[PDB]
Design a protein around this ligand. Structure first.
Ligand SMILES: CCNc1cc2oc3c/c(=[NH+]\CC)c(C)cc-3c(-c3ccccc3C(=O)OCC)c2cc1C
Ligand SMILES: CCNc1cc2oc3c/c(=[NH+]\CC)c(C)cc-3c(-c3ccccc3C(=O)OCC)c2cc1C
Lengths: 572, 572
C-alpha cells in the first residue's frame, strides 16, 4: 500500500526510468567492488611485508581496481542527476497544476502554507530518491558481506569478542537513559521556576503596594532551594555515571586489542590482516544506522507523497474554460442565486438583481464581507451553486472563461504590484500584442499616469523588492492604464471606499471616471461618498438582497432604514 | 583585567573558597593520575602478556590505582556541588534585590527580558564555574602529558607520522569548505525560488482575471530550471569530493597501521605499548575541542557577568523608605508638579491640585500623558523630582513608604488573582496578624462578593495555573475584600472605565463605594456612569489639570469643547 501511490506519481516523470536501471546497477558494483577493496588492501599491505619492493603486476592490478572504484563513485553522479531530473519534472508538473488549479482551493487551504509545502515535500522526496535508496542497498550489502568476510578472516577468533563487545556495552544504555530522565527533570524544574517568576513578576506593583516584600522573597527562596536540591541529585548521578562509562569503554578496548595482540597475533593475525579488519569495522559500523534513517525518511516521504497526489488530483479548470467565444456588450441580470462553500451551507441566498448596459452600478452591504461573494459571482468566478444568470437565452455557462473574462476585463484596488518591471507590469495581462510604442496613447489616456511619465523614461526603475514602495496612487494609475489597454471599456473595481481616507482615491477618481464614462461597470464600496455620484446602488444584507431602484427610492426607503445610520458612523 | 570584576560578584557570596581549593586540588590530582594511568595499563597488559601467570601484586596495584581514579572522578562531585552552591547563592542575591527594585526599572526594561536573563545568564555562569574551568585545566595538562609520554613511550618514529596525518588533513579541509559554500548557494537559491513564487501566488486573483497564466508558467519554468541547473553542479561537486575524502582517509589509516605492523613485526612496539598508544590518542583528541569550547563559552559568559553586575546596582527604593511613621489621615495637595522619566523627557507640565479628607475624588482626561501618570505619581511609584506633595510641611515626601502604603489601599481593573490559596490572597497585605477565622467578618456587605461567599471549601481555591478558577470580575470582589480587611483609610482604584462594557462594573461598584462610605478614594473614572459618584473631578487636558470642581458643573464647563461628544461616543 505504501509504494503504490508513490510509484503512481513517480511514473509521471517516465522517460528517465531506464536510466535508473543503469545507475542502481552502477551502484551495486560500487558496493561489490567496495566489498573487495579491503581484500586487495591486504594483498597490498602484506605485499610489502612478504615481498619488499613488490612486483609491478600486483601494483598495476591494485591501481586499476582503485581507479575502477573511484570512477564508480563518480558514476554515482548519474544516480544523483537522474534524481534531480525526476524532482524537477515533478515540481514543474506540480507548479503547472497549482497555477491552473481552481482559485477555490486557494482561499480555503492557507495558500501561504501550501507554498512552503511544495518545496519541503519535494525536498524530502528528493532525499528519498537520491541517496537513501542507494544508502539502504549499500548498507545491507555492506553489513552482510563484511560479516561474511570477517567470518572468513578468522576461525571464529576475534569476531566473536568483537560482537560481544556491544553485548557488554548494553550495560551503558540504562545509565544513559537514567541520565536523560534526570536531565529532563532538570529542564522541567527550570521551566517551572521560569514560569513562576514570569507569572509573579508583573505583579510587582501589587506586592509593593501591599508591602508584602518578605513573603515574595520567601516564595522565591522556596523555588530556588527546590531547584538547588534537584541540581544536587543531577550532580550525584553525573558523578556516578562518569567513571561507570569511561571505565567500561576503556576496558572493552583494552580487552579486545590485548586479546588480538597476545593470542591471535602470535599465531595467526598478520598486520595486513588487522588493517583490513579495521577497514571492515569502519565500513560496517558507519552505514548501519542509515537503515533506520531510511525507514523514518521513507515514512515521512510517503506522507509527503500522499500530500502531493492529493494536490494533483484536483484539476478541473482546463476543459471548463475552453468554451464558446463571445463579444459581450449585453446587460447583466441575476435570477434567484445562491452560493456557499458547501452545497447545503450557503453564504448567499435567494438574491436577484438587474444591471443595464452603460449604467454604472455599485454594491453596498454588511462590512463583514457579504457583498464579496456576490461580487465574485457577477464576474463569473465561482460556478453558481444554484440559480441562473439572465442573458439572451441565458447561455452564461457555455461561454469560455477566458473570452467573456477578457471582454469584460478587470481592475483592482487593494495594492497589487510587481517590482521593478513597470512596463512589463503594464503588459502583464495583455493579449499577445507587444505594442512597443503605441501604448503611449494609453499612458496619456490614463490622465494621471502623465504626472508620472518620468518613470516610463527610466522604463524599468525598481522601487523595492516587493514593489509596495510605490504609493497607492502610482499603482492606481498603472491599473487604469492596464484597464484602458485591455478593452475599450468594461470594468469592475473592488474596495473603493474602504481605505485611503477618501483622499488619494479622489485624486485618482478624476482619472478613472472620465475614461469609464458611459460604460458598464461594477464597484464595491462601504461608503456613499463616490457611489452617490451617478450610480445605481444595490443594498446587500447578510447573504440576502433587498435593494432595488437606481438611487433615490432605494435611499429614501432602505438607507433611511439602514444605510443612513451606518454611513453616519463613517463621517469621521 | 575582567577577572577581578567577575570575581567581585562571584565573591559576593563566599562560602565556596575552601571547597573550591579542595575541589581543584582533587581535580589536578585526577589529571596527573589519569596521565599516569596508561603506563599502569601497559604494565598490566604486559604482565598478562609476557607472563601467563601475572603476579597478584601487579594486578593489585592496577586495581588500587583504578579504584583511586574512579574515586577521584567521584570526588569531582565536590566541584560540581560547590558550583551549584555558588550558583544558588548568586541567584538568591539577584532575586533578593531584584524584587526590591523601583518600578521605574520594570516599566522600562520589560518583564520577560529580565527573567530570561535571570535563567540564561545564571546557567552560563554555572557552565563556566562547574565544568569548563576544570575542562580547560585537564585539557592542557592532558595534551602536554600525552605528548610527552608519546615522545617517551614510543620513539619519535610513530609520533611523527601520527602528527603528519593531521597535516595531511590539509588536503581534506578546503574541499569541505567548498562543499559548505556551494551548499549555502543551494540554500540561497531555494530561498529565492520560494520567495519569488510566494510573492507570485496570492495575485492568482489578478492573473486569472487576466487569463495570462501562460506567462506565469513560463516564469515558474525559468525559476525551476535555474534551481535544477544549480543543483546539478551541487551533485557534481559532491560526487567529486566523496571518493577523494574517502581515499585520503583510507590511505592515512592504511599507512599508520602498516607502519605499526612493520614496527611490531620488527621490534620496539609491543602490544601493550600499542594499547597505551591508542589510549593516549583518545585521551588527547577528546579535550582539544574542549579548550575551544571553553574559550567561546568564557567569551559569551563575560557579557553575562556584565549584565549581572549591572543588575546589582539600584537597591535604593526600599532602602530609603525606613524613615518615619504617621497617622496620615489629612487632606492632600499637589504643587508645582511637572514630571517625567528624565528632566529632558517630560511627561507632565506644571500642575497643582487639592484633594479633601472625606469625599470621593477622581481624575479624568485623555489617556496619552494624562490621568495614568499623575495617578502613579500620586501613589509614590515615581519619586518626586521638582514638585511637592503637601500633607502639611511636605511631610509625605519625608515619611516612610511603608507607613504610607499601610495607610493606603490599591485595587485595579485588571484584577489578576495572584498565585496561592484564597486564604493568603485575602490576608496578603496583613501578614502581621494571622487572622485565623475573622477575615470575612467585615466583607459580607459587599453586594457582589456574596456570589462566592457561599464557597464550601472557602480556603482551598487558588490560582490553579493562570488564575481563572475565579473570574477577573470576581477577583474584583476578592480584591475589595482584601482592601476592606487591610485598609481602614484612603484608597485608590484603577479602572479604564471605557472598557469591558462596564456591564458588571456597576454590579461591583454598588459594593465598593458603599463599603468605602467615608474613606478618601481616587479612581480612574472617565466614563459617564463612574463620574456620577466621583464628586470632585480632576480633568486632564494634556498632562495638565485645567479645572477643579464638582462633578456636574465641571463637566458642563469642560464639555463646552470636547467632553460631551467624546463621552457620548464612549458609552457606545
Ligand atoms: C576512555 C576513552 N574515552 C574517553 C575518555 C575521556 O577522558 C576524559 C578525561 C578528562 N579528564 C579527567 C578529569 C575529562 C575532563 C573528560 C574526558 C572525556 C570527556 C570529555 C568531554 C565530555 C565527556 C567526556 C566523558 O565521557 O568522560 C567520562 C567521565 C572522555 C571521553 C571519552 C569518550
Ligand atoms: C557507497 C555507499 N555510500 C557511501 C560510502 C562511503 O564509504 C566510505 C568509506 C570510507 N572508508 C573506506 C575506504 C570513508 C573514509 C568514507 C566513506 C564515505 C563518506 C565520505 C565522505 C563523507 C562521509 C562519508 C560517510 O559515509 O561517513 C559517515 C560517518 C561514504 C559515503 C557514502 C555515501
Amino acid at each position: 500500500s505504501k509504494l503504490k501511490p508513490f510509484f503512481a506519481l513517480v511514473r509521471r516523470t517516465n522517460p528517465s526510468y531506464g536510466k535508473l536501471a543503469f545507475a542502481l546497477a552502477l551502484s551495486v558494483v560500487t558496493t561489490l567492488v567496495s566489498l573487495l577493496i579491503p581484500l586487495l588492501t591486504k594483498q597490498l599491505v602484506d605485499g610489502f611485508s612478504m615481498s619488499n619492493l613488490s612486483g609491478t603486476q600486483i601494483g598495476l592490478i591494485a591501481l586499476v581496481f582503485f581507479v575502477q572504484a573511484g570512477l564508480s563513485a563518480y558514476a554515482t553522479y548519474a544516480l544523483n542527476y537522474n534524481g534531480q531530473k525526476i524532482i524537477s519534472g515533478l515540481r514543474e508538473l506540480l507548479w503547472k497544476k497549482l497555477i491552473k488549479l481552481p482559485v477555490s482551493y486557494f482561499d480555503t487551504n492557507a495558500s501561504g502554507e501550501t507554498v512552503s509545502r511544495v518545496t519541503n515535500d519535494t525536498m524530502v522526496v528528493k532525499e528519498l530518491i537520491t541517496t537513501h535508496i542507494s544508502g539502504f542497498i549499500t548498507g545491507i550489502i555492506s553489513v552482510i558481506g563484511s560479516l561474511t568476510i570477517l567470518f572468513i578472516m578468522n576461525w571464529k577468533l576475534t569476531l566473536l569478542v568483537l560482537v560481544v563487545v556491544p553485548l557488554a556495552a548494553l550495560i551503558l544504555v540504562p545509565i544513559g537513559r537514567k541520565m536523560f530522565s534526570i536531565s529532563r527533570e532538570t529542564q522541567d524544574e527550570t521551566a517551572r521556576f521560569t514560569g513562576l517568576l514570569n507569572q509573579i513578576l508583573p505583579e510587582i506593583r501589587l506586592v509593593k503596594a501591599s508591602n508584602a516584600e518578605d513573603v515574595e522573597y520567601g516564595r522565591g527562596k522556596m523555588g530556588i532551594s527546590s531547584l538547588f536540591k534537584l541540581g544536587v541529585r543531577e550532580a550525584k548521578v553525573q558523578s556516578l555515571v562518569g567513571p561507570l562509562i569511561s571505565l567500561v569503554l576503556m576496558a572493552a578496548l583494552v580487552a579486545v586489542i590485548g586479546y588480538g595482540g597476545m593470542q591471535v597475533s602470535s599465531g595467526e593475525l598478520t598486520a595486513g590482516a588487522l588493517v583490513a579488519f579495521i577497514l571492515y569495522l569502519f565500513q560496517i559500523i558507519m552505514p548501519m544506522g542509515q537503515i533506520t534513517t531510511f525507514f523514518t525518511q521513507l515514512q515521512k516521504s510517503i506522507g509527503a507523497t500522499e500530500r502531493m497526489i492529493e494536490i494533483l488530483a484536483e484539476e478541473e479548470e482546463d476543459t471548463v474554460t475552453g468554451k464558446q467565444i463571445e463579444n459581450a456588450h449585453l446587460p447583466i441580470q441575476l435570477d434567484r442565486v445562491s452560493f456557499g462553500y458547501k452545497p447545503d451551507q450557503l453564504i448567499l441566498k435567494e438574491v436577484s438583481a438587474v444591471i443595464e448596459a452603460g449604467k454604472v452600478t455599485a454594491i453596498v452591504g454588511p462590512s463583514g464581507g457579504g457583498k464579496t461573494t456576490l461580487f465574485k459571482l457577477l464576474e463569473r468566478f465561482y460556478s453558481p451553486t444554484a440559480g441562473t444568470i439572465r442573458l439572451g437565452d441565458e447561455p452564461v455557462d457555455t461561454y469560455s472563461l477566458e473570452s467573456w473574462r477578457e471582454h469584460i476585463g478587470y481592475v483592482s484596488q487593494e495594492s497589487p504590484l510587481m517590482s521593478g518591471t513597470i512596463r512589463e507590469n503594464i503588459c502583464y495581462g495583455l493579449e499577445r500584442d507587444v505594442t512597443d510604442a503605441e501604448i503611449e496613447k494609453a499612458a496619456e489616456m490614463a490622465y494621471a499616469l502623465n504626472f508620472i511619465k518620468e518613470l516610463p523614461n527610466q522604463f524599468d526603475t525598481e522601487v523595492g523588492e516587493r514593489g509596495i514602495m510605490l504609493s497607492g496612487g502610482q499603482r492606481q494609475r498603472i491599473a487604469i492604464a492596464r484597464a484602458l489597454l485591455r478593452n475599450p471599456s468594461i470594468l469592475m473595481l473592488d474596495a473603493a471606499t474602504s481605505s485611503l481616507d477618501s483622499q488619494s482615491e479622489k485624486s485618482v477618481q478624476q482619472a478613472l471616471e472620465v475614461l469609464m464614462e458611459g460604460r458598464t461597470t461594477i464597484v464595491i464600496a462601504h461608503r456613499l461618498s463616490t457611489v452617490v455620484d451617478a450610480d445605481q446602488l444595490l443594498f446587500v444584507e447578510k447573504g440576502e438582497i433587498t435593494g432595488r431602484g437606481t438611487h433615490h427610492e432605494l435611499m429614501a426607503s432602505h438607507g433611511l432604514y439602514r444605510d443612513f445610520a451606518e454611513q453616519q458612523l463613517k463621517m469621521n
